[PDB]
Write a protein that binds this ligand. Sequence first.
Ligand SMILES: CCc1cc(-c2n[nH]c(C(=O)O)c2-c2ccc3c(c2)OCO3)c(O)cc1O
Length: 214
Amino acid sequence: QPMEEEEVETFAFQAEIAQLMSLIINTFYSNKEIFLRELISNSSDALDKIRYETLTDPSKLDSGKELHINLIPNKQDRTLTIVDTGIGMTKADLINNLGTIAKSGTKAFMEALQAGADISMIGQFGVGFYSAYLVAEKVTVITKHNDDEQYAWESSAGGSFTVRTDTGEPMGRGTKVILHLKEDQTEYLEERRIKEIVKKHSQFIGYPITLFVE
Ligand SMILES: CCc1cc(-c2n[nH]c(C(=O)O)c2-c2ccc3c(c2)OCO3)c(O)cc1O
């Protein structure tokens, strides 16, 4: 019965990243499906990192040996979750990688979009994670690194994000991205569509990808 207390840290995004987010959110783009390719590619990069780091430190895998990616659509709560057993991120990694630090690609990318370039180019500018906002109104990133506790990052955009120690289900190690889909983007919860886009854009990821249906 005692009330629980939870500490939260709210951070403002870096100015151009915030501009980029408004651009992605309030502009119509037709090839939205590449958001999934970008997430799986981020997961593949993180899996590569724990993989190589373990060659020289097998203990690094005590937090989990499987190196893979799971996709979990949930039609009830309208979320598409992408989980990987990659190296994860510490709290500081989270805060720096997801918002507070300027990326040199942002401006060039925003200018390129203003010129009508395809949103698919986004990964080439180092800000592919933000493509999640093409289909999600809110994004929650839960991550666990061997050197730190499990944290949850969350943002509905609007210029800021929060970080807090995660009270949710523990992960051994890795990063889980939960996309709360916009209502007109529920196609990405359909198994056929997900298989279609993973086959089209991610046929070559070198880690198993498993789609869990129901
Ligand atoms: C939210 C972006 C994202 C990041 C990771 C991830 N986990 N650990 C790490 C790490 O570099 O240590 C990452 C990571 C960090 C930055 C990246 C990245 C993966 O891909 C492009 O930019 C991940 O595994 C999945 C993701 O979707």
